[PDB]
Design a protein around this ligand. Structure first.
Ligand SMILES: Brc1c[nH]nc1-c1ccncc1
Length: 93
């Protein structure tokens, strides 16, 4: 049943030194910098930063929110929890 990751998919994404973080697979706009091969453009909710990650660091949101979706002290985390639950597809400019 699982497919490859696609723009709009909601995830927790893992960065070194950070808790699993609410995020989405982003689109790539025309003329924008493309990701390296086998990586995805990840938009992190709350901080609104972007990084390029491979699937080993991407966890489906609905399967893993009971484990990763509790509030955390790190800057922007609880804001990101609100975004992913309440408007995950908005433009955060
Ligand atoms: Br983890 C995370 C949450 N927001 N931003 C990040 C991040 C951390 C490191 N490098 C790029 C982006």
């Amino acid at each position: 049943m699982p497919h490859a990751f696609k723009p709009g998919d909601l995830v927790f994404a893992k960065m070194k030194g950070y808790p699993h973080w609410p995020a989405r697979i982003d689109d790539i706009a025309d003329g924008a910098v493309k990701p390296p091969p086998n990586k995805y453009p990840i938009f992190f909710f709350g901080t609104h930063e972007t990084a390029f990650l491979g699937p080993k660091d991407l966890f489906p949101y609905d399967k893993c929110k009971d484990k990763y979706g509790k509030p955390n002290k790190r800057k922007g985390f609880n804001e990101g929890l609100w975004e992913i639950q309440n408007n995950p597809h908005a433009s955060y400019s």
